[PDB]
Design a protein around this ligand. Structure first.
Ligand SMILES: CC(=O)SCCNC(=O)CCNC(=O)[C@H](O)C(C)(C)COP(=O)(O)OP(=O)(O)OC[C@H]1O[C@@H](n2cnc3c(N)ncnc32)[C@H](O)[C@@H]1OP(=O)(O)O
Ligand SMILES: CC(=O)SCCNC(=O)CCNC(=O)[C@H](O)C(C)(C)COP(=O)(O)OP(=O)(O)OC[C@H]1O[C@@H](n2cnc3c(N)ncnc32)[C@H](O)[C@@H]1OP(=O)(O)O
Ligand SMILES: CCCCCCCCOCCOCCOCCOCCOCCO
Ligand SMILES: [Hg+2]
Ligand SMILES: [Hg+2]
Lengths: 390, 239, 390
């Protein structure tokens, strides 16, 4: 059965993904976006009392301006969550959100709280990814300065595994294709929390779909794009790279015991967690070391996993990871079935929990038992989580 | 004095500390011409032989620290057959290395411009204290060449590949402020305190407060970078 | 005995505290300061293999510039810690460092790593506390904008508990007095990691003491100071407020099992942890709700605690907390025995683990069995940890 202290995911909710460049969230702050989301998710789960929330752990990377000073607490204060609850912001670059979930999970397992709210956010429109970045000169004495430029790390991982321009463009076409399909078929209806935004004309209205998706993306349209990081020989382009998006993700997590008491059916249960490091230069490879450690902790083999969510940082880093994870031939059967970051965007702080949320819904919809969410992390890291639907 | 030449002098100071000063008599600047290199050889051997020496301060008596030799000598030197040129540089480098291998703490007091060979002399020391008005850099690429006195060896092991490449491939002059940020230098002070700062620093090295051996070590071994990080760094640099 | 998964603190190390305004660390980056510290602490504990470090959890608040993009990983990369290890940066404002410790601890308890490096940093000289701060207008709809100004919250907590100007100045005089005494008597010799810095003349040298301490601080000198946050009626001054400092703290943490194997004597063991929230306006009161929750989890009473470390944000918030914690009359016997933030400074990211480190050494030196480190957190929170020397 489920032990009292096992970690249960009660529900998952995310905002519609908006284009940072003039998109739907252009007039919405990161704190407000986070509060609104938290508020709505808690509203759909009326049996979970906000006062019971021990901690609000939020993932966010560029913590300055709208996102500085512990945005997790700033957002909580504008929610039905009482002042008596705590809140902390976590940063592990791309994996911030997943780390948020792990910290709450671990807190639940050790008896330091029963109910938590995790998630993350990143409004790249208001706090661009290169905003306030000050390279440390001394770093060049231990690693390559170029390792800090994600695009170049994709180029390197790609050349090293021989991922062609065609292979990358194909993955991208599939991503938009599958994201659009899922949208149209209402596969994102349960996880997407409708939200107010603005259209190109500044008109106020509600959005319940991801703007980022581009259904008109074909091999032909992508072939016309030029390399984005290596003018002479590069294969990575804007079309096969994750988008600059504005978004937030959220999850209600609690001990199994509390879930039993409240009489609510778990969306899933956590079976294992893991982080790991790799060289900064090939950060995109982070998922394989992390996934291996997590699978071992879960007592499972890659084959036991029914569905996989691998963040699509770059097709150039996703494809190699899938091959080395030994599931490339199983791609269309269990990998990013509803599209990925190339079509859905990669708002740093938000992604960790986001792909995990989408995974849970993919598992629910396709009768999966075990799921794996994993992603590469800038500056050489990988993080992974194993979920079980029981 | 311990050593008295026409370009270099080595005068004894307090507590066994010794000062090797560059002052090319009759000329407006210091530069590594044939004469100076030969005298450095002698000054080094003199210090290397004086068992009472407890530390060395390298300074300048001119407005500049040390600049490059006359373009004239560059032209001549580059006409020599590869074997001779390389043998001549092996010899010059042996001098700087010997100064670097002194079993005593060394500090370079950069009072003014230190370009090419001048900077290379500074890189050979354990510590470098620079006046906030001075400038340093390796302009070798301007002449179609690159550092020839250990510059490509010492700078990368001192400030990191990316930064060394930036300095060497551009040959730009660097201000005190920037030199401190990349750690090409260890302290920046006003012109009036350069002497005192160098004297103060040397004593802390002698007392063991500052581990001069550990600070020197990095330029006597391989870079710290991974085979992986190396590839990333060099390939992007070339690109 | 100690269960295999109990959490052990192998060692503690901190940098000399420097004045942000022209101090010793004025030419040292946050990443380098963090790396150097981690390197030295690992060097004193040669039996702990850097390659075994699962995660480097670092606390830091203003994460932009030198402190942005997961400074925990940036610092780790310039250490003997391998690229294979992971790293994340935690933010819970003032309590960031303590949360870092809690996360690693919880990781150890659940079998998700055996050896961790925790700590934190804040270089307020390079990243001032008000740098990049962008108040959210919408916040005023739920809380008072003034609650974001720590000084005013101190004024409010003080008026509410009737803490006089005299009482506050007295606490401050005691703080400098006790910090100086501890310095002179070498009571900080074990925890302070000597480090390179610069004096007023730019001369390079080593510092092994805290510049922040001002032995010449008397009731007379403090009485001459003017209110810093409330011109007419205020009682809080710069003299009774924590200082703007540059500093880093660090700890090596590991399972008791691993400590047993490696044959190393624990500096202390964690018995309980807890965070809690209070209204933003009286954030300084955070320690009492948190300390109560932690004491209950530890199965102890405030009386069972031999020594206490309460972060000195403002004398105005420290005194009320001590009274309501019911240990004011026990102050000179067990509270901040080696001085506090008023004399040692409060570098946000670094403080949590710092006061905890100083606590452990206070306990070791005075034969204490149980210790409590706790602090208030901006925007209404409190955090606490209970340590046991066994
Ligand atoms: C570890 C991890 O998991 S995280 C990985 C981190 N990834 C990232 O940070 C993403 C990196 N991406 C970037 O930095 C930027 O998006 C860049 C550099 C690739 C592109 O930005 P810019 O330099 O501004 O160029 P630009 O935005 O114009 O490029 C987009 C162009 O491609 C076109 N394009 C993009 N995707 C598509 C597509 N699917 N189909 C057709 N055209 C497309 C756009 O129409 C646009 O062309 P336009 O200007 O004519 O409208
Ligand atoms: C929630 C938590 O855990 S922590 C809360 C965070 N803490 C804070 O926000 C308070 C931090 N302090 C500050 O921000 C600043 O010190 C302030 C705003 C209080 C005052 O700043 P300023 O207006 O610039 O005044 P300033 O800092 O220059 O100091 C005022 C004078 O008092 C003097 N002074 C300060 N402390 C002392 C002291 N202990 N003894 C004697 N003189 C003192 C200073 O030397 C200065 O005199 P000087 O100018 O001749 O040198
Ligand atoms: C950055 C280093 C610059 C080195 C360039 C050398 C040009 C400067 O001329 C100074 C001469 O000393 C350099 C050593 O010369 C090498 C060859 O020595 C043989 C000279 O042949 C003359 C025999 O009478
Ligand atoms: Hg990234
Ligand atoms: Hg604060």
């Amino acid at each position: 059965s489920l032990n009292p202290r096992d970690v249960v995911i009660v529900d998952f909710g995310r905002t519609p993904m908006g284009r940072s460049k003039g998109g739907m969230h252009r007039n919405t702050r990161a704190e407000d976006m986070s509060a609104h989301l938290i508020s709505k998710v808690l509203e759909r789960n009326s049996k979970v009392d906000p006062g019971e929330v021990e901690d609000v752990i939020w993932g966010c990377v560029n913590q300055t301006l709208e996102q500085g000073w512990n945005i997790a607490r700033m957002a909580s204060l504008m929610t039905q969550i009482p002042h008596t609850s705590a809140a902390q912001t976590v940063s592990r670059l791309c994996g911030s959100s997943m780390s948020a979930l792990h910290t709450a999970a671990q807190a639940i397992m050790t008896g330091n709280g029963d109910v938590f709210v995790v998630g993350g956010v990143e409004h790249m429109g208001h706090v661009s990814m290169m905003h306030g970045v000050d390279p440390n000169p001394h770093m060049s004495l231990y690693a390559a300065k170029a390792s800090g430029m994600m695009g170049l790390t994709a180029e390197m991982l790609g050349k090293m595994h021989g991922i062609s321009r065609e292979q990358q463009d194909a993955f991208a076409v599939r991503s938009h294709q599958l994201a659009h399909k899922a949208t149209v078929e209402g596969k994102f209806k349960d996880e997407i929390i409708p939200m107010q935004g603005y259209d190109e004309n500044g008109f106020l209205k509600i959005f319940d779909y991801d703007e980022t998706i581009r259904p008109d993306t074909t091999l032909e349209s992508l072939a016309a794009l030029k390399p984005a990081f290596n003018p002479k020989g590069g294969t990575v382009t804007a079309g096969t790279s994750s988008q600059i998006t504005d978004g937030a993700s959220c999850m209600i997590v609690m001990s199994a015991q509390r879930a039993k008491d409240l009489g609510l059916e778990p969306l899933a249960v956590i079976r294992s967690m893991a982080v790991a490091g790799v060289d900064p230069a090939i950060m995109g490879y982070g998922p394989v070391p992390a996934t291996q450690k997590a699978l071992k902790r879960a007592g499972l083999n890659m084959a036991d996993i029914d569905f996989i969510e691998l963040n699509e940082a770059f097709a150039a880093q996703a494809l190699p990871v899938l091959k080395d994870l030994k599931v490339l031939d199983k791609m269309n059967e269990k990998v990013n079935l509803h599209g990925g970051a190339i079509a859905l965007g990669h708002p740093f702080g938000c992604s960790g929990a986001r792909i995990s949320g989408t995974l849970l819904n993919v598992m629910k919809q396709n009768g999966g038992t075990f799921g794996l969410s994993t992603m590469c992390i800038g500056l050489g890291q990988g993080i992974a989580t194993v979920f079980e639907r029981v | 004095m311990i050593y008295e030449g026409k370009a270099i002098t080595v005068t004894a100071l307090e507590s066994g500390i010794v000062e090797l000063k560059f002052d090319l008599k009759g000329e407006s600047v210091n530069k590594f011409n044939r004469l100076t290199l030969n005298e450095l050889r002698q000054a080094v051997d003199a210090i290397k032989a004086d068992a009472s020496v407890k530390g060395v301060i390298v300074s300048s008596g001119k407005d500049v620290f040390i600049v490059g030799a006359d373009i004239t000598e560059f032209v001549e030197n580059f006409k020599l057959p590869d074997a001779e040129l390389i043998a001549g540089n092996l010899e010059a480098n042996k001098i700087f290395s010997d100064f670097e291998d002194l079993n005593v703490p060394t500090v370079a007091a950069i009072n003014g411009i230190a370009l090419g060979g001048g900077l290379e002399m500074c890189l050979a020391a354990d510590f470098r204290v620079m006046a906030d008005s001075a400038k340093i850099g390796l302009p070798e690429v301007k002449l179609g060449i690159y550092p020839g006195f250990g510059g490509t060896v010492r700078l990368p092991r001192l400030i990191g590949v990316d930064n060394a490449v930036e300095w060497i491939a551009s040959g730009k002059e660097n201000r005190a402020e920037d030199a401190l940020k990349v750690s090409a230098v260890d302290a920046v002070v006003t012109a009036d305190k350069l002497g005192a700062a160098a004297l103060d620093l040397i004593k802390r090295a002698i007392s063991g407060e500052l581990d001069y051996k550990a600070k020197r070590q990095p330029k006597l071994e391989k870079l710290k970078l991974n085979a992986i990080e190396q590839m990333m760094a060099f390939e992007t640099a070339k690109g």
